[PDB]
Every structure is written in C-alpha cells, then in structure tokens.
Ligand binder design. Structure first.
Ligand SMILES: [Zn+2]
Ligand SMILES: [Zn+2]
Ligand SMILES: [Zn+2]
Ligand SMILES: [Zn+2]
Length: 65
C-alpha cells in the first residue's frame, strides 16, 4: 500500500503526479500517454494540440520534454 504518496490513491481527489498530468483526472487510461522520459501521464485530449487518437509510434514524449 499506497502506490502514490501525493493524492494517496484517493480516487475522489485529483492528481497530476499519478493521473493525467494536466487535468489530474483518472478517467480513460486507454486514452492516456506516458512520456517515456518524464513518465507522467497525459489525456490525449488534454494535450495541445489534442490528439484525435493515440499515436501508433508507440514511443511518445510529453510537451514538458
Ligand atoms: Zn496521486
Ligand atoms: Zn486530462
Ligand atoms: Zn515527459
Ligand atoms: Zn508539469
């Protein structure tokens, strides 16, 4: 127990560290990206520009990187 210290897995709270690093929402994992060199996660639709769908180039890098 617990995998993330910051929100303490409290699904009722937001977390940019363990969840979507922009909205901090936990929905739609299928639609989240992990920046291979920042390791945080991103809703394809929270991006800018936002992506209509996941990239195929299975190695993604966040806008922070
Ligand atoms: Zn957290
Ligand atoms: Zn988001
Ligand atoms: Zn990154
Ligand atoms: Zn950041």
């Amino acid at each position: 127990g617990p995998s993330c210290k910051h929100c303490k897995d409290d699904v009722n709270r937001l977390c940019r560290v363990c969840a979507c690093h922009l909205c901090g929402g936990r929905q739609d994992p299928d639609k989240q990206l992990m920046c291979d060199e920042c390791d945080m996660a991103f809703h394809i639709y929270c991006l800018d520009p936002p992506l209509s769908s996941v990239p195929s180039e299975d190695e993604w890098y966040c806008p922070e990187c």
